[PDB]
């Protein structure tokens, strides 16, 4: 049986983890207590288990966000052994999460990985949820990703890392943690997907008319992106996109594995009735820069490979028409070495709505994950923040004292400059 | 399961910390007797950060009280919320240091250090996973500025991986409360730069302007200033005791607010302050607290923050608020006046939220600022030093207790080194 | 040790120039470094001890803490360079009453303090290189009523450049100094 | 080349050479920070 083991690391990992497993349980009808709703029925409910346990691990070195799950509305879905806590958090330090205090828990975390790998029949991939701005997301994320490549081969690793916004941040050592974490995602992660908090705010503010959004409103639609991309494994459809279909069609080269994301029908409950939502106009709104989860302009770069994943009652006739209308637009630019630039997946299940959630019931949705050379636009802004802070060598005695050396700063910076060069070389075109 | 040892030294540390445990007992529902009487489970989820469970289910504070004069502990013990503390923790002397740093740090305080460090070691080893040691004291005095900094130096050798939150009041600019304020302040700051991990700076005069201009208290008593100081101390530790969308512990603040190992002096301020004549007209929102947060008159430090650039500022928001309002207001305060912020650190603001506001308020915020304008405070005390140092006035009381005059020149040459790097970081530019 | 191996006149305890300079001396560093650097004015290889903290980094002549040293000579001569920084050295002696008395000189103090067990001393030095003539018998006779017998420990914990520390019976100037003990070579 | 080196050394004064021993280094600093232009040129050469 096809399956994916997910790993949620840090503050942002398991707050999305509360949101993603909220949507996962509603998609399959799983109740919050874990049991999906004559002598066998008594046997199946009490002595045996009709309970479904998630194949996730919720690990963080700070217990406050972990015990919220242990005491929340989903206390019975997860195994008590499955959620991992710690004494002291990595505390906005890649040095603590990767060398000093992340080393003690990463041995315990892989033991629960081994139990989840033995429980499954056939494994397909790994989902990693973390934030590259925090110490636990960067440090313990890099430590877990480094070890997962050692014990496990041919099993892909999917990354959904919340990268920092260019303008607003909730931390000051934010450029340092992301630069050091970036070198680990290039080396050890098969597919990484950028996520930007400021872009989610603009989607919530404009297309969903919420003036005062919080992290609960952000994670509800990030979970919509995560649930849609793995939805071809859970449900059947006219065209399927497996987790190995996703690698083989969105990384032309091994180093380029950074993809954007977009969800097309972000329409509120009041605005839904007036809106006509067919396949032709949601795909036009899918490529809209206001509808992207990364604060970047895709017109700056050019798309290399793009995957349009559809949910609901979508015929294959009109997704091809949406492909043709996008390819003829002069603003959406493709690179010249990828003529067949699209992969289309259709899932017959309409997107479920979280009860009390902001999104309305729509019968059509597009989850657009695209490989573009506009990722180098994101990493260039984050590089210039790193160069100014490293010139004065501030916030370095925290990293140097807790195990790291000075040479790791220049080493991870040099890898990112190669990626800046890598996009400018791959995105180059041949004309006449 | 993260937990902080409280250490109160001197008359100032005991009086402020008596008011500090008033807020913490009321926030966690602990009655005057000590027993739990909270109305919410979230208060009881993290009590072990500050309180140790005893017999009968009542909780004693994890506080160690030290002063060489028995007068101050009589007021703390016999006063309200005074029966919660443990009498074994009341480690205290008889002779009296008497405003002398030499008596508190070398001669008279030393016979009590082996006693106070014994009960701190008992409190530290018994509890499971420490954070640091929160210490409240003064710098103009000699009993708390003297004996307190000896513990801070000694507790750094025993536990070097734990932090030192120090809340030290400084000499006032307009007035002196002791004649030997420049002696004790310079000699204690030098003992704090290499020992204390992070320092919060307070003074009486900045709180006097807060109590009069904003709170409209024409007769602000001795505990009214302590209530404002106690509200700051609870606001620093708010993410530890209670959950939130963005929790930030003590180590997250110091890794963000400290760019270089000696720039660890901070100015603080509590945002939602208003008089009862204007309580019903204030619209408590994220823009309203942010407007009061960044104002110079709200800071509890004598240094005017308009004079220098904020190297790093942090705010510990509390209340059921949206993160984007917290995000966009602190993004806007950088862009409107970018001259008053430093330029070579992008994203100066450390923002974090706690979902439980304090009792009686629907929204609150606690602000920490690492501004280079605080060099005006150290420049003033050093200016008062060299005027008094050049005549050996009030100096034989310090050298009569075995102290060399080298430690005076040792102290201010670290004070002059401290004010020199503050000036050079403000002047420095990138590209 | 060093009781049977007694030499008449001088007794060199540590010389920087050689195949292995730190032959008998234990080493200890903490936020500092020990570095054999050829200086500028002498152009000769001298050992250097550097540290941000004085009390953390040190070198002691007896390697094992339990073992003791023995020199009956009443003079200790150290040739050190003044780095315009903290210097600190410490000599422990065994007196007439079989008691251990530690004379500990430093650059960061200006007044001498005589505790019943440890005496603390100021040190003032000239600009460049220097030799210091610590008179063991005279210093122990000034500090206490007893007289010198032997030196158990010698230990420099400082920021300095050392070469040619040794023991002497009496004051010996340049013209009667032995061949390889000069460091000046007039 | 030796004559040029001697001409340089006649004015460059006796430089304190690196230690052949380097007996102990508690912080383990290792290599030092390169200058800005030299570091930029070296990074450009490495990326080329």
């Amino acid at each position: 049986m096809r399956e994916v083991i997910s790993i949620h690391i840090g503050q942002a990992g398991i707050q999305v983890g509360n949101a993603c497993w909220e949507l996962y349980c509603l998609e399959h009808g799983i109740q919050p207590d874990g049991q999906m709703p004559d002598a066998f029925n008594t046997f199946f409910s009490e002595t045996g288990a009709g309970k479904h346990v998630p194949r996730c691990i919720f690990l963080d070195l700070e217990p406050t966000v972990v015990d919220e799950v242990r005491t929340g509305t989903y206390r019975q879905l997860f195994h008590p052994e499955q959620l991992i806590s710690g004494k002291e958090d990595a505390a906005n330090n890649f040095a603590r999460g990767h060398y000093t205090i992340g080393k003690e828990i990463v041995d315990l975390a892989l033991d629960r990985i081994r139990k989840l790998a033995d429980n499954c029949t056939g494994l397909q991939g790994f989902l990693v949820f973390n934030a590259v701005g925090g110490g636990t997301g960067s440090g313990l994320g890099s430590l877990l990703l480094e070890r997962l490549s050692v014990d496990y081969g041919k099993k892909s690793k999917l990354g959904f890392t919340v990268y920092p916004s260019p303008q607003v941040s909730t931390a000051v050592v934010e450029p340092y943690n992301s630069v050091l974490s970036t070198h680990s995602l290039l080396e050890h992660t098969d597919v990484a997907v950028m996520l930007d908090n400021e872009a989610i705010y603009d989607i919530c503010r404009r297309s969903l008319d919420i003036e005062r959004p919080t992290y609960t409103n952000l994670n509800r639609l990030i979970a919509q992106v995560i649930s849609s991309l793995t939805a071809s494994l859970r449900f059947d459809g006219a065209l399927n996109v497996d987790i190995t279909e996703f690698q083989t069609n969105l990384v032309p080269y091994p180093r380029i594995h950074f993809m954007l994301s977009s969800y097309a029908p972000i329409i509120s409950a009041e605005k839904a009735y007036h809106e006509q939502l067919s396949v032709a106009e949601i795909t036009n709104a899918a490529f809209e820069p206001a509808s992207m989860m990364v604060k970047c302009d895709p017109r700056h770069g050019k798309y290399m490979a793009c995957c349009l994943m559809y949910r609901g009652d979508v015929v294959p006739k009109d997704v091809n028409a949406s492909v043709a209308t996008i390819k003829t637009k002069r603003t959406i630019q493709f690179v010249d070495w990828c003529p067949t630039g699209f992969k289309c997946g259709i899932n017959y299940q309409p997107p479920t709505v979280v009860p009390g959630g902001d999104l309305a019931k729509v019968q059509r949705a597009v989850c657009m994950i695209s490989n573009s050379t506009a990722i180098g636009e994101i990493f260039s802004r984050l590089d210039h923040k790193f160069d100014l802070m490293y010139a004065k060598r501030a916030f370095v005695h925290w990293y140097v004292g807790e195990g790291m050396e000075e040479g790791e700063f220049s080493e991870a910076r040099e890898d990112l400059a190669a990626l800046e060069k890598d996009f400018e070389e791959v995105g180059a075109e041949s004309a006449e | 399961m993260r937990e902080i040892v409280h250490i109160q030294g001197g008359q100032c540390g005991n009086q402020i910390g008596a008011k500090f445990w008033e807020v913490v007992s009321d926030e966690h529902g602990i009655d005057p007797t000590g027993t739990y009487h909270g109305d919410s489970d979230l208060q009881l989820e993290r009590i072990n950060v500050y309180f140790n469970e005893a017999t009968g289910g009542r909780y004693v504070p994890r506080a160690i009280l030290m002063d060489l004069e028995p007068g101050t502990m009589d007021s703390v013990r016999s006063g309200p919320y005074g029966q919660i503390f443990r009498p074994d923790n009341f480690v205290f002397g008889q002779t009296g240091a008497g405003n002398n740093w030499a008596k508190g740090h070398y001669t008279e305080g030393a016979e009590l250090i082996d006693s106070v460090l014994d009960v701190v070691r008992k409190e530290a080893e018994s509890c499971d996973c420490l954070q640091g040691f929160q210490v409240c004291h003064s710098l103009g005095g000699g009993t708390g500025s003297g004996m307190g900094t000896l513990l801070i130096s000694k507790i750094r050798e025993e536990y070097p991986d734990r932090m030192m939150l120090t809340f030290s009041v400084v000499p006032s600019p307009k007035v002196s409360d002791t004649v030997v304020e420049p002696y004790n302040a310079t000699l204690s700051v030098h003992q704090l730069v290499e020992n204390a991990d992070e320092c919060m700076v307070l003074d009486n005069e900045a709180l006097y302007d807060i109590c009069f201009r904003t709170l409209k208290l024409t007769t602000p008593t001795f505990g009214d200033l302590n209530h404002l100081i106690s509200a700051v101390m609870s606001g620093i530790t708010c993410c530890l005791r209670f959950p939130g969308q963005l929790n930030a512990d003590l180590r997250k603040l110091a890794v963000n607010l400290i760019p270089f190992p000696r720039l660890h002096f901070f100015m603080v301020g509590f945002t939602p302050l208003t008089s009862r004549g204007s309580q019903q007209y204030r619209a408590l929102t994220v823009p309203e607290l942010t407007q009061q947060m960044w104002d110079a008159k709200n800071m509890m430090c004598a240094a005017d923050p308009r004079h220098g650039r904020y190297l790093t500022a942090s705010a510990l928001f509390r209340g059921r608020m949206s993160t984007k309002e917290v995000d966009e207001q602190m993004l806007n305060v950088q862009n409107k006046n970018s001259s008053y912020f430093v330029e070579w650190i992008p994203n100066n603001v450390k923002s974090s939220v706690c979902d439980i506001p304090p009792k009686g308020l629907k929204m609150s915020a606690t602000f920490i600022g690492n501004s280079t304008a605080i060099q005006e405070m150290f420049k003033r005390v050093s200016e008062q030093f060299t005027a008094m140092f050049r005549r050996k006035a009030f100096l034989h009381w310090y050298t009569g207790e075995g102290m060399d005059e080298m430690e005076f020149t040792e102290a201010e040459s670290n004070m002059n080194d401290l004010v020199s790097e503050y000036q050079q970081y403000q002047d420095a530019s990138a590209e | 040790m060093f009781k049977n191996a007694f030499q008449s006149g001088f007794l060199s305890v540590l010389y920087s120039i050689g195949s292995k300079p730190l032959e008998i001396w234990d080493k200890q560093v903490s936020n500092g470094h020990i570095k054999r650097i050829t200086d500028a004015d002498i152009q000769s290889s001298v050992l250097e001890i550097m540290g941000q903290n004085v009390s953390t980094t040190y070198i002691t002549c007896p390697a094992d803490p339990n073992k003791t040293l023995g020199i009956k000579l009443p003079f200790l001569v150290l040739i050190i360079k003044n780095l315009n920084k903290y210097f600190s050295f410490e000599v422990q002696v065994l007196d007439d009453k079989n008691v251990r008395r530690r004379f500990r000189a430093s650059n960061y103090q200006s007044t001498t303090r005589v505790k019943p067990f440890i005496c603390t001393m100021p040190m003032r030095l000239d600009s460049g290189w220097n030799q210091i003539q610590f008179n063991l018998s005279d210093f122990t006779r000034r500090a206490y009523g007893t007289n010198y017998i032997e030196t158990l420990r010698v230990q420099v914990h400082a920021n300095c450049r050392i070469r040619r520390i040794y023991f002497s019976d009496r004051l010996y100037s340049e013209e009667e100094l032995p061949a390889e003990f000069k460091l000046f070579l007039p | 080349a030796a004559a040029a080196g001697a001409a340089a050394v006649a004015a460059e004064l006796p430089f304190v050479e690196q230690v052949e021993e380097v007996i102990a280094e508690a912080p383990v600093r290792g290599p030092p920070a390169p200058p800005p232009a030299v570091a930029a040129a070296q990074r450009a050469s490495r990326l080329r």
Binding site: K392 | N414, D417, S420 | - | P32
Partner: peptide
């Protein structure tokens, strides 16, 4: 008679002025 950060340039030569002020 006659590359490095600003904090390190202060800290290296700070002990010389520690001596010199006395």
């Amino acid at each position: 008679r006659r590359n490095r950060t600003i904090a390190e340039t202060m800290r290296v030569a700070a002990d010389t002025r520690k001596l010199g002020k006395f």
